[PDB]
Amino acid sequence: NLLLPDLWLDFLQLSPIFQRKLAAVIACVRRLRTQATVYPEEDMCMAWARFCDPSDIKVVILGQDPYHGGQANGLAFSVAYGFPVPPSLRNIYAELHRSLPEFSPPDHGCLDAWASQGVLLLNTILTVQKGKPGSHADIGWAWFTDHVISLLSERLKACVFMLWGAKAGDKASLINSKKHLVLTSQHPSPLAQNSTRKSAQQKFLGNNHFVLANNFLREKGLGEIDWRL
């Protein structure tokens, strides 16, 4: 059991050895779950893969690891209904509101409608121990999500990749930037919001990434994302 939907197994075409390596990471998490609280639950750590067919993915947004206080829902940046909106997601909403006149920031952190429209909200690390950010950074998730990114770049005809901050930016070398639109900026975190008129990288607020993404999709003949929540 690789926890992935059948469409994703078909899409990835994992070799037997890669299947065993993924199974080994899953087994590691299973061992860690009996010793401590791990987020999200096992049957939610692949939720990011269950909202659309992988062939229909149009935008990839990379996060780091899941929230570690129980608010993670298996999607990058998103939180379940009823949870307060985290700071980075608030700033994402702020950039959407600046760039898209029809977008009004919602009172929730649920990004399900984006995922259903082909926005892949992929954390590079898929589990985390309660209260300990980065605690599962070295158990093998990074190999798997790197491979997922590579295969999305290879197998999709046209896709947008939004890489915010240094960690996500490190993944750019996995993506064929002639096929795909690779959008980069500083992280949406409020910590990175007000800084230095020095940053070689563009600020998150003002990066125009959601407009540029829909322009790309329109140019390639794909349906645009309705970003409204």
Binding site: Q64, D65, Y67, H68, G69, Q71, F83, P84, V85, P86, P87, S88, R90, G131, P133, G134, G165, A166, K167, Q186, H187, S189, P190, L191, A192, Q193, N194, S195, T196, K198, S199, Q201
Partner: protein, 112 residues
Amino acid sequence: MTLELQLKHYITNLFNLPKDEKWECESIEEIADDILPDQYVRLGALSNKILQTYTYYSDTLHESNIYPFILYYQKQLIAIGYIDENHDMDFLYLHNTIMPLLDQRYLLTGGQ
């Protein structure tokens, strides 16, 4: 968890926030150059070092337009403070991996 509790006590007292409201945390890694003021990021010190960050949030914190935060480099405490209403960082503590640059931890209940 001592430091997070001291920061919560300090912030809820300073801004008269409910002491029993649960705080949640967002953690991301990012290089110090993008998250700290320019004057505190120097070659051979904080420059080009990846920090692990904790930013706290809640309903009343959002209402006050403040973001309390704690920054670390590996196991070394790097910063304690909050982003204020003007989006200015106000530090209770700041260390550049070599030495403390700012230390008002006497405002905390730790005795440091």
